[PDB]
Design a binder for this molecule. Structure first.
Ligand code: HEM
Length: 398
């Protein structure tokens, strides 16, 4: 029995519970009428994520081979981006990933702690009034500035990039605007790369350009695709991580009391938010080169697989009978896999942990009484099916 993912994300908790119930391999419908499989249990996700029969090569997708995927499908930017580390495996994946991954180790991202701290304090300084949209005024700008600095993007481009990524991630973007959004994104990223080719810097775009002389030899198009990937994957997720941590503390007063009183550390808030309420509900997209058994089902060769990180985060087989609860003090035998698992594991994990690990204590140090300004049930997800993304975060600064 297929689960059609709600394009309007009207009850994400209920949909996640249905996906777990239908697992480990659930039949699902992506917005736009595209049928795929979703892995929704922790153990089977880890196996599929390291299974060499589950590849990123879209030429393996039967629906792609048959020409049944429209180029103006709103999800096309997520399902079929340009060639980058995201869309390859094997030796090509190593070549396309190594520079970025090594630039983002925990040791390397510490270099940015000062910039992240200064950005955080500057944003907190500008909060005005008793009630604010903390997403628009804080959680959204911080990771956009951070990834823009990382990648050498001109800060003057960030307002437009924000407008474009809103369309990129929405299920409701009309066909002409799907296409126009991807073309304009390509232009902004190409302009950034062209600028760094002329004057190479410490930013990661410059580093990729230099390595394409000096070893890795990514093509011009692959560098632009990698830049777009880094901005897409690095701002949207980190914003939701900060938003969801504030929501979770505001809906669990004992957990808020623990961390604000020093009985638990902020890292535990971040890690439990990642497990309980990941920024990334689903990851597109993998394809079976051969029939693959999953539980009592067979994933047929040529079919597609998404990984339902949101659903599997609350898998009771992984975390026990309290897996559906937000508990920053929990003991579990299984660490969460909200950054993925295997070769494609998020290279930005340390940077996101640093951003959230700086932003959250700074926020509550400035505003110890900070609370949602509305009952949490009134918060509304944007029509973004792969990301847990809220329209706004009304907050009383207290
Ligand atoms: C903030 C929380 C974040 C979460 C929850 C997250 C989640 C993930 C996950 C689950 C994957 C692997 C998907 C899969 O293979 O199934 C991934 C890949 C990736 N992420 Fe993150 N991410 C976050 C932040 C970031 C940041 C800050 C950056 C960049 C600075 C980034 C860049 C990437 C890239 C480039 C990939 C592709 C890696 C590959 O396929 O080799 N992410 N992310």
């Amino acid at each position: 029995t297929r689960i059609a993912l709600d394009p309007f994300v009207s009850d994400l908790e209920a949909e996640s519970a249905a996906l777990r119930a239908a697992g480990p391999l659930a039949a699902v419908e992506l917005p736009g009428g595209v049928p795929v499989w979703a892995v929704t249990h922790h153990a089977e996700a880890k196996k599929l994520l390291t299974d060499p029969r589950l590849v990123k090569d879209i030429n393996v997708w039967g629906a792609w081979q048959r020409g049944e995927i429209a180029p103006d499908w709103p999800l096309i930017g997520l399902a079929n981006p340009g060639r980058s580390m995201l869309t390859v495996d094997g030796a090509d994946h190593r070549r396309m990933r190594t520079l970025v991954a090594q630039a983002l180790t925990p040791r390397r991202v510490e270099q940015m702690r000062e910039r992240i701290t200064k950005l955080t304090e500057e944003l907190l300084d500008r909060l005005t009034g008793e009630v604010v949209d903390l997403k628009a005024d804080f959680a959204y700008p911080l990771p956009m500035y951070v990834v823009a600095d990382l990648m050498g993007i001109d800060e003057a481009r960030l307002p437009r990039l924000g407008e474009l990524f809103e369309k990129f991630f929405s299920t409701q973007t009309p066909p002409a605007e799907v296409i126009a959004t991807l073309t304009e994104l390509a232009g902004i990223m190409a302009e950034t790369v062209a600028a760094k080719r002329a004057a190479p810097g410490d930013d990661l775009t410059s580093a990729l350009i230099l390595a394409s002389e000096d070893g890795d030899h990514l093509t011009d198009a692959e560098i632009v695709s990698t830049l777009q990937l880094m901005v897409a994957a690095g701002h949207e997720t980190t914003i939701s991580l900060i938003v969801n941590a504030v929501v979770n503390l505001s809906t669990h007063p004992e957990q808020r009391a623990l961390v604000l009183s020093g009985e638990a550390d902020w890292s535990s808030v971040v890690e439990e938010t990642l497990r309980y309420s990941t920024p990334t509900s689903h990851v597109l997209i993998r394809f079976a080169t051969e029939d693959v058994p999953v539980g009592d089902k067979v994933l047929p060769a040529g079919d597609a697989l998404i990984v339902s990180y949101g659903a599997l985060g609350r898998d009771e087989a992984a975390h026990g009978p309290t897996a559906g609860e937000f508990d920053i003090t929990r003991s579990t035998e299984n660490r969460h896999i909200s950054f993925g698992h295997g070769p494609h594991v998020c290279p930005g994990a340390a940077l996101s942990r640093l951003e959230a690990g700086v932003a959250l204590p700074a926020l509550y140090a400035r505003f110890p009484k900070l609370d949602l300004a509305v009952p949490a049930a009134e918060l509304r997800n944007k029509p973004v099916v792969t990301q847990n993304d809220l329209f706004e975060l009304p907050v009383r600064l207290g």
